[PDB]
Amino acid sequence: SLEPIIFYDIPANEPRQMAWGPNTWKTRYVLNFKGLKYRTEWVEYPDIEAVCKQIGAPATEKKPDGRDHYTLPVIQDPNTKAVVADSDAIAKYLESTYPDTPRLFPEGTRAFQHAFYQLARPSVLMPIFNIVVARVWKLLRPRSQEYFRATREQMLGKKLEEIGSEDDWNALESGLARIKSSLEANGAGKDLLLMGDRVTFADLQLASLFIWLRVSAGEESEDWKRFLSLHEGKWAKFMQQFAAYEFVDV
Amino acid sequence: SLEPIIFYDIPANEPRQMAWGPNTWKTRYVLNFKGLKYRTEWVEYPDIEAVCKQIGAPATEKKPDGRDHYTLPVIQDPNTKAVVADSDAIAKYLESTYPDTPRLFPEGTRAFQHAFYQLARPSVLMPIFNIVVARVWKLLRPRSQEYFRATREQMLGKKLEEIGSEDDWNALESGLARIKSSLEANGAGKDLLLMGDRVTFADLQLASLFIWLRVSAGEESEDWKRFLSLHEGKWAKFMQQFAAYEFVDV
């Protein structure tokens, strides 16, 4: 008797790529993993601010000029009238509001999980960004394309085509090497999940970076094939754990 | 009836500064916190390789030339004949070998703790290094001084006196800002320990960086006073939790 949660995500111009975002995938992973009923409302980049304002979703940050900056994912929960932005806030909301669903925040782990993503962001998200950003622009619909190109380039001071070198693959490998040695501190048979034998939001956050690569580059691309080869296939084994949680409603 | 564990540490030319090292303090904190009986064997920098070889302590890493590099802390446990190097390995050894002592590795936390120190090292250890490295050289005894200067400078390609600028305090503040926001994910009243209401090795690792600053710079220095002021005194409150675990046997 629960009404579907409305989940706001950014579409693409090809069905296989409809769900592509690294941050929106954090929320889709949580929704899927927790087994909550939802529907995706697909929102183009330049329409994000408008939709947020229209539903009372807060902005998640300020621009360099101090002006409000609105981002997805956002969810609207008809069952409680909650409207929540930012994937971390959304995860904790769902944990708290649907306590019967599978837990992603075991006690005493919230700082550790937060710190983990602070390590992953610069060392894994940033290299993957450089690797895929041109192909991201390519998979977006036209109104989204102009907004995306204009924003990212203004920030990067560089044409999108001029980003994405071999230095990025080196940096990615090094960041993953540190995550690999962290996982290994759990000991053999426990070294594919941060807590060894259960999934946390932090694991899904890492997976979100990986699936962003796979969807942007293409599951059959040389780039994805190269990723699956890193560290004797460890991240292939990592991602295989989350295959059942990748449903997209298109 | 337990015999004291022998703990190898690097001395200084002033009693207040005898225990100064960021890594050796990780082991001293663990020994103190766990309430284990120990004695410090004080070993000068150039004598570390010799002492290690003499007691069967392994090297913890290789130099750029691939040659073995021996470091302290090391412990020798007469009760089991164990000789263990590297502060992480030493902590886990003590956890495992003395299970009745206060726990520092709760289940499911080993990867999270490892990842946390990977975040702290570049963002907190490295800025503090730049800040104190000249005063570190200053507090060492003469044979240690030459070794320390020669090694660090060969690595830094810069005289020790030319290191330590305002950029370092900015970088330190930014690294601590990220750790601060991680701790705050635990919620109010739980935001001074990574797990909120218990101490882990990861907390002691952060404390080791802080006490290194305090001992190197001096508890009364402007630099230590400045550290205690950062973030409305949060790190002062953090360090106050570990005051009872700072016994030094000099």
A249 closest CA partner among A30, A32, A79, A69:
A32
Q: Indicate the length of chain A as a whole number.
A: 250
Which residue type, as a one-letter code, is found at position B121? R
Beta carbons of A106 and B110 less than 8 Å apart: no
A71 Cβ contact list (under 8 Å, min separation 6)? A23, A48, A59, A60, A61, A85, A86
Tokens standing for residue A192: 């594919």
Q: Indicate the length of chain B as a whole number.
A: 250
In chain A, what residues touch B196 (CB-CB under 8 Å)?
108, 110-111
Cα–Cα separations (whole angstroms), residue B51 to A195, B57, B76, B94: 38, 8, 11, 21
Place of tokens 């001293």: B28
Task: At A156, give phi and psi (nearest 5°).
Answer: -90, -15
A10 closest CA partner among A50, A39, A41:
A41
A-B CB pairs within 8 A amount to: 89
Cα–Cα separations (whole angstroms), residue B155 to A11, B161, B213, B241: 50, 14, 21, 35
CB of B6 closer than 8 Å to CB of B41: yes
CB of A233 closer than 8 Å to CB of A42: no
The CATH number assigned to the domain holding B187 equals: 1.20.1050.10
Any idea of the CA torsion for A64, A69, A74, A76, to the nearest 10 degrees? 150
Half-sphere exposure of A240 (CA within 13 A, CB side): 7
In chain B, what residues touch A181 (CB-CB under 8 Å)?
114
3-class DSSP state of A245: helix
A134 closest CA partner among A99, A158, A104, A103:
A158
The Cα–Cα gap between B209 and B201 comes to 13
The Cα–Cα gap between B235 and B175 comes to 12
A8 and A62 part of one domain = yes
Beta carbons of B115 and A114 less than 8 Å apart: no
Q: What is the DSSP letter of B8?
A: E
The helix (run of H) or strand (run of E) holding residue B75 is strand B74-77
- In chain A, breaks (C-N over 2.5 A) are found after none
B117 and B68 part of one domain = no
In chain A, what residues touch B185 (CB-CB under 8 Å)?
110-111, 113-114
A134 and A112 part of one domain = yes
Any idea of the CA torsion for A76, A80, A86, A88, to the nearest 10 degrees? -140
Interface test with A, best of B114, B174, B192, B197 (most A CBs within 10 A): B114
Beta carbons of A186 and B110 less than 8 Å apart: yes
Which residue type, as a one-letter code, is found at position A214? R
A120 and A239 part of one domain = yes
The Cα–Cα gap between B241 and B193 comes to 9
A134 and A92 part of one domain = no
The helix (run of H) or strand (run of E) holding residue A226 is helix A222-227
Beta carbons of B109 and A110 less than 8 Å apart: no
A147 and A238 part of one domain = yes
Q: Are strands A5-9 and A38-42 parallel, antiparallel or unpaired?
A: parallel
H helical segments located in A56-199: 87-97, 110-120, 126-139, 142-156, 166-184
B121 and B238 part of one domain = yes
The Cα–Cα gap between B47 and B132 comes to 23
* Residue where a domain terminates, one of A51, A85, A105: A105
Sign of the Cα torsion A236, A237, A243, A246 reads negative
Q: How many C-beta atoms surround the C-beta of residue A67 within 10 A?
A: 8
- Chain A residue with minimal CA distance to B202? A112
The Cα–Cα gap between B16 and A234 comes to 48
B188 Cβ contact list (under 8 Å, min separation 6)? none
Beta carbons of B185 and A119 less than 8 Å apart: no
Residue B170 CA from chain centroid, whole number? 22
CB of B124 closer than 8 Å to CB of B206: yes
Interface of B with A (CB under 8 A): 106, 108-116, 118-119, 178-179, 181-187, 191, 194-198, 202
* Residue where a domain terminates, one of A56, A74, A105: A105
The CATH number assigned to the domain holding A14 equals: 3.40.30.10
CB of B19 closer than 8 Å to CB of B215: yes
B71 and B137 part of one domain = no
Edge-to-edge strand order for the sheet containing B5-9?
A: B38-42, B5-9, B74-77, B82-85
In chain B, what residues touch A182 (CB-CB under 8 Å)?
111-112, 114-115, 118
Tokens standing for residue B63: 């130099």
The Cα–Cα gap between A245 and A211 comes to 11
Sign of the Cα torsion A213, A11, A250, A105 reads positive
CB of B101 closer than 8 Å to CB of B36: yes
Beta carbons of A197 and B109 less than 8 Å apart: no
Query: Cα distance from B110 to chain A (closest Cα, Å)?
Result: 6
Cα–Cα separations (whole angstroms), residue A93 to A88, A204, B29, B228: 9, 16, 38, 35
Sign of the Cα torsion A48, A49, A54, A56 reads positive
The Cα–Cα gap between B67 and B44 comes to 20
Q: What is the DSSP letter of A66?
A: S
A111 closest CA partner among A242, A200, A204, A239:
A200
3-class DSSP state of A31: helix
In chain B, what residues touch A118 (CB-CB under 8 Å)?
119, 178, 182
3-class DSSP state of A44: coil
Q: What is the CA radius of gyration of chain A?
A: 18
B124 closest CA partner among B69, B182, B81:
B182
B58 closest CA partner among B72, B46, B44:
B72
3-class DSSP state of B66: coil
Using CB atoms, which residue from B112, B178, B184 is nearest to A118?
A: B178
Tokens standing for residue B202: 């990861």
3-class DSSP state of B5: strand
Query: Cα distance from B141 to chain A (closest Cα, Å)?
Result: 35
Helix/strand/coil percentages in chain B, nearest 5: 55, 10, 35
Q: What is the DSSP letter of A65?
A: T
Tokens standing for residue B22: 């960021």
The Cα–Cα gap between B225 and B215 comes to 12
B101 and B116 part of one domain = no
A177 closest CA partner among A123, A121, A139:
A123
Beta carbons of B108 and A109 less than 8 Å apart: yes
A158 and A219 part of one domain = yes
Experimental method: X-ray
The Cα–Cα gap between B176 and B123 comes to 8
Cα–Cα separations (whole angstroms), residue A223 to A172, A199, A208, A218, B22: 12, 27, 17, 8, 41
Beta carbons of A186 and B115 less than 8 Å apart: no
Residue B85 CA from chain centroid, whole number? 14
The Cα–Cα gap between A223 and A232 comes to 16
Beta carbons of B108 and A197 less than 8 Å apart: yes
A95 and A184 part of one domain = no
- Chain A residue with minimal CA distance to B107? A195
Query: Cα distance from B126 to chain A (closest Cα, Å)?
Result: 15
In chain B, what residues touch A114 (CB-CB under 8 Å)?
181-182, 185
Tokens standing for residue A6: 């409305």
The Cα–Cα gap between A210 and A239 comes to 8
A219 closest CA partner among A203, A243, A241:
A243
Q: What is the DSSP letter of B123?
A: I
Quote the crossing angle between the two packed helices B110-120 and A166-184, to the nearest 10°: 140
Place of tokens 């090297």: B59
Using CB atoms, which residue from A110, A119, A187 is nearest to B186?
A: A110
A151 and A191 part of one domain = yes
Q: How many domains does chain A have?
A: 2
Q: How many C-beta atoms surround the C-beta of residue A192 within 10 A?
A: 18
Sign of the Cα torsion B242, B243, B244, B250 reads positive
In chain A, what residues touch B187 (CB-CB under 8 Å)?
110
Beta carbons of A115 and B110 less than 8 Å apart: no
Which domain covers residue B68, as residue numbers?
A: 1-105
Place of tokens 């997976």: A207
- Chain B residue with minimal CA distance to A184? B111
Bridge partners (DSSP) of residue A5 are A38
* Residue where a domain terminates, one of A56, A71, A105: A105
Quote the crossing angle between the two packed helices A24-34 and A201-217, to the nearest 10°: 120
Long-range own/partner contacts, residues B16-20 (CB < 8 A, 24 or more apart)? B16/B215, B17/B139, B17/B215, B17/B216, B18/B42, B18/B248, B18/B250, B19/B215, B19/B248, B19/B250, B20/B136, B20/B139, B20/B212, B20/B215, B20/B216
